[PDB]
Design a protein around this ligand. Structure first.
Ligand SMILES: CC(C)(C)c1nc(-c2cccc(NS(=O)(=O)c3c(F)cccc3F)c2F)c(-c2ccnc(N)n2)s1
Ligand SMILES: [Cl-]
Length: 255
């Protein structure tokens, strides 16, 4: 049903690529983002794999999740989504250095906690959550998307990854903790470790978790506790997003 005829899609300039596909700004009844997959003439085992991915994205309707809009097969395999007018959270924290007040910081965390709560409720695991995947639409509304190398958000257990299935709900919770670290400190974790291979090594064996003493003076005390609980070493000792969301939903009212 969601099959959009291509000729309507005016493909524009290239935005870039990440963990999935190559992204372009486009037009389809207004501004849209167009994610090319670079698959020419799909084999039935690729068309079904494409429809399996579409089937997962189709299952998301939430104001904090990036709005899936359609998909094309001719001339190329592509996914059309809403266009976010703004900049990523990573961009605001480590590129622009935007002066967010604490009210705004906790707000961004709350919207992300709801989107993650929605995703987990629909049994969807992000697997690559990070501040670059938190798009601040109109510098107000969080839009989560972009479902190699980006280890600062990887949990310890994702370093095994050869026995069973290491990506879990708890692994998404850990990545959310790192986003909280960025929000409350203004920095990426492990600022003084100038070599990735040792970060991978340390976090993997577990002798390394971010320094919760870089947090800004006005960081709430419950936020400190929540960060520590999300960044706990063992999978099973991390809180689910229903508890995370509820904890933040109390902090915003106190603030
Ligand atoms: C810079 C980087 C990281 C390469 C980007 N990828 C997308 C992008 C574009 C389209 C889809 C998805 N994510 S997705 O493919 O996994 C997805 C859907 F295709 C549909 C619904 C939800 C969803 F997460 C994206 F991350 C970006 C993007 C998305 C929306 N608006 C803007 N301005 N940029 S940016
Ligand atoms: Cl539908």
């Amino acid at each position: 049903d969601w099959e959009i005829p291509d000729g309507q899609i005016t493909v524009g300039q290239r935005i870039g690529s990440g963990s999935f596909g190559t992204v372009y700004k486009g037009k389809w009844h207004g501004d849209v983002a167009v994610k090319m997959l670079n698959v020419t003439a799909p084999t039935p085992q690729q068309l079904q794999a494409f429809k399996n991915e579409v089937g997962v994205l189709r299952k998301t309707r939430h104001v904090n999740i990036l709005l899936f809009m359609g998909y094309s097969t001719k001339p190329q395999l592509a996914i059309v989504t809403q266009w976010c007018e703004g900049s990523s959270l990573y961009h605001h924290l480590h590129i622009i250095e935007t002066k967010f007040e604490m009210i705004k910081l906790i707000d961004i965390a709350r919207q992300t906690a709801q989107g993650m709560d929605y995703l987990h409720a629909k049994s969807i695991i992000h697997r690559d959550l990070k501040s670059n995947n938190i798009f601040l639409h109109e510098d107000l509304t969080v839009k989560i998307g972009d479902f190699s190398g980006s280890i600062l958000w990887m949990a310890p257990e994702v370093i095994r990854m050869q026995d069973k299935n290491p990506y879990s709900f708890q692994s998404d919770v850990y990545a959310f903790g790192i986003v909280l670290y960025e929000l409350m400190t203004g920095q990426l974790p492990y600022s003084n470790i100038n070599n990735r291979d040792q970060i991978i090594f340390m976090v993997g064996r577990g002798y390394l978790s971010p320094d919760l003493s870089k947090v800004r003076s006005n960081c709430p005390k419950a936020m400190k506790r929540l960060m520590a609980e999300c960044l706990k070493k063992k999978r099973d000792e991390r809180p689910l997003f229903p508890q995370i969301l509820a904890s933040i939903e109390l902090l915003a009212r106190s603030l």
